[PDB]
Ligand binder design. Structure first.
Ligand code: CLA
Ligand SMILES: CCCCCCCCCO[C@@H]1O[C@H](CO)[C@@H](O)[C@H](O)[C@H]1O
Ligand SMILES: CCCCCCCCCO[C@@H]1O[C@H](CO)[C@@H](O)[C@H](O)[C@H]1O
Ligand SMILES: CCCCCCCCCO[C@@H]1O[C@H](CO)[C@@H](O)[C@H](O)[C@H]1O
Ligand SMILES: CCCCCCCCCO[C@@H]1O[C@H](CO)[C@@H](O)[C@H](O)[C@H]1O
Ligand SMILES: [Hg+2]
Lengths: 177, 163
């Protein structure tokens, strides 16, 4: 009927919030996962779009390329900063992913695919800003691999990222408390 | 029960702990700062100071350097393991703030290295070209940044580590 009084356990303030703080402020791992999916689809669409048109994504979006970074649209620079900070989990990494207590990707695997996507996307965008060359052209130049031999390998990436972006992942999200 | 915070998110208990990461991060802070300072003193990027070939495509660069860049990048995003937690003790910088300064240093270092490989220009010169700000107006701010990383690399940070 009446519950016994519980000796209140010393609650732990976890340092996994915005820039590491413990004040419960910042993205959860779920938020990060979503943002990561958006980056997966964006990166994939960038590569596919360039593979089809021959033009980088920023060029297709009517933005100036082949310019120093300080001349680029500040909104683009902000998106790049956001993407990078998110990739390293600086915008908050609150909570945990755990195995479903009881054979594809787990939610954490998904999270890391998302972070890799964020890195590659940010790097490719900065690259296009400075050089005027899209992610595919950059890949061709830096790998030494001819375009015809790099196209299928890139198409495999587009498919990989697209599938990953829709895959929920196994396991469950758990709040710090 | 089984946390997914190990190597590439695995729960097997394989991978770096947050402490390992923090250490690697300190090493990164010191490396980055020392490379900036070194460019200031020598006028040459760190890779040129180490006499490594620059102004070249990535695939022609030394495999150990590329190894190091990948390692640094994967470490920055926690893919090499992020096991355990940092919690408040039951300036003001916690070990988590420290971890993120380290990750920032890792991103910046990796960036500058790839940039130097491709362009043959050190981090300071990259900064100059990409901000429009003259080198002489740049160096004080960078020196301040250099002092910060050295301070952070040595600062233990408050809080503790839980398994
Ligand atoms: C030593 C380990 C090593 C590691 C861990 C990395 C890690 C990374 N590299 Mg670098 N790289 C290396 C050595 C390494 N590289 C060497 C030796 C070269 C010269 C060819 C390059 C040239 C290179 C380029 C141009 C790029 C990367 C990229 C990458 C990323 C992943 C892509 C990848 O793994 O393909 C690496 C390729 C292999 C590991 C080759 C497969 C190995 C099989 C086992 C052996 C094949 C040898 C040969 C073909 C067999 C016949 C021998 C002879 C007849 C030729 C990551 C940053 C890319 C990136 O920036 O992110 C995506 C990128 O664009 N790498
Ligand atoms: C760079 C592209 C996106 C810019 C801003 C990202 C805002 C992050 C919020 O994420 C939220 O996290 C939840 C997790 O489940 C989702 O359910 C929810 O729908 C989603 O809104
Ligand atoms: C609880 C687990 C749910 C996992 C799967 C959720 C779907 C995530 C897909 O992201 C989508 O990315 C696009 C970016 O271009 C947007 O158009 C679109 O609005 C956005 O929804
Ligand atoms: C240029 C190479 C990259 C950096 C070296 C990687 C070593 C990773 C192991 O971390 C360990 O974590 C502890 C945390 O407390 C430290 O005390 C300890 O000394 C350290 O060994
Ligand atoms: C300081 C941290 C890392 C340890 C090793 C530093 C690398 C510098 C050594 O130069 C070596 O000699 C020649 C000149 O660069 C090159 O032909 C060769 O590629 C390179 O191997
Ligand atoms: Hg030499």
């Amino acid at each position: 009927a009446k519950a016994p009084k519980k000796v209140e356990k010393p609650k732990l303030k976890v340092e996994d919030g915005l820039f590491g703080t413990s004040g419960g402020i910042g993205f959860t791992k779920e938020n990060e996962l979503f943002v990561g999916r958006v980056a997966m689809i964006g990166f994939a669409a960038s590569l596919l779009g360039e593979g089809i048109t021959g033009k980088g994504i920023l060029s297709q979006l009517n933005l100036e390329t082949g310019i120093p970074i300080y001349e680029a649209e500040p909104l683009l620079l902000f998106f790049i900063l956001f993407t990078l900070l998110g990739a390293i989990g600086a915008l908050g990494d609150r909570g945990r992913f755990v195995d479903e207590p009881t054979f594809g990707f787990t939610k954490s695997n998904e999270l890391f695919v998302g972070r890799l996507a964020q890195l590659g996307f940010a790097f490719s965008l900065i690259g296009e800003i400075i050089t005027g060359k899209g992610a595919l052209a950059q890949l061709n130049i830096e790998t030494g691999v001819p375009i015809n031999e790099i196209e299928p390998l890139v198409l495999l990436n587009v498919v990989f990222f697209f599938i990953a972006a829709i895959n929920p992942g196994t396991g469950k999200f758990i709040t710090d408390d």
